[PDB]
Amino acid sequence: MLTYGAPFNFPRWIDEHAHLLKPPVGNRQVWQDSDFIVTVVGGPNHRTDYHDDPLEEFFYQLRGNAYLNLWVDGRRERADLKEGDIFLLPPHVRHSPQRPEAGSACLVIERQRPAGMLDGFEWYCDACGHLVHRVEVQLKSIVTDLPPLFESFYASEDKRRCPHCGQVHPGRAA
Numbered sequence: 001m002l003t004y005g006a007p008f009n010f011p012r013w014i015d016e017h018a019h020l021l022k023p024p025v026g027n028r029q030v031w032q033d034s035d036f037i038v039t040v041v042g043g044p045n046h047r048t049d050y051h052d053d054p055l056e057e058f059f060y061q062l063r064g065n066a067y068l069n070l071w072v073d074g075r076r077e078r079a080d081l082k083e084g085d086i087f088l089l090p091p092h093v094r095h096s097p098q099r100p101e102a103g104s105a106c107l108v109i110e111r112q113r114p115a116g117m118l119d120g121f122e123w124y125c126d127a128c129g130h131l132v133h134r135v136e137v138q139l140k141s142i143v144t145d146l147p148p149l150f151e152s153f154y155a156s157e158d159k160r161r162c163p164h165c166g167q168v169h170p171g172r173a174a
């Protein structure tokens with residue numbers, strides 16, 4: 001049986017869910033309980049956290065523009081996601097997506113993580129570049145498992161404190 005339903009028009013789905021593709025929500029998963037996690041992410045959203053995904057991530061920037069702050073080969077880099085761009089990110093490449101434009105929409109496709117395969121979320125010092133805090137997580141649900149992780153970081157000056165130069169990470173903003 002067609003567990004995930006029949007085909008449907010994508011642009012229409014996006015327009016009908018436009019109020020969810022903006023703060024405070026920002027994103028929407030298309031299908032529930034599937035092996036492929038298919039999400040549409042909108043904007044605006046800026047963030048400071050870097051994601052360490054143990055599996056690949058596919059991006060297709062449908063509307064608007066965005067960029068990914070990355071660490072590549074020990075250096076900070078940027079991959080620009082201009083409207084119409086596609087991109088495949090290898091596992092473990094640290095990335096922090098920035099989505100400045102309202103009304104933007106990006107297709108992001110991931111896989112469910114098997115038991116034991118953990119996601120990491122990291123923050124780095126604006127001053128010296130050292131890792132400030134890393135949390136690893138078994139990701140079952142984005143909505144429940146993720147926000148409190150970000151919240152405890154922002155609320156603790158200890159977690160935000162660089163172990164190399166003592167500068168305290170700004171937390172939420174930058």
Ligand SMILES: Nc1cccc(C(=O)O)c1O
Pocket residue numbers: 041051057096097106108
């Ligand atoms: N962490 C993460 C995983 C998959 C997609 C995004 C996105 O907002 O581009 C993201 O920020």
Ligand SMILES: [Fe+2]
Pocket residue numbers: 051053057095
């Ligand atoms: Fe990610």
Ligand SMILES: [Fe+2]
Pocket residue numbers: 125126127128129130162163164165166167
């Ligand atoms: Fe530092």
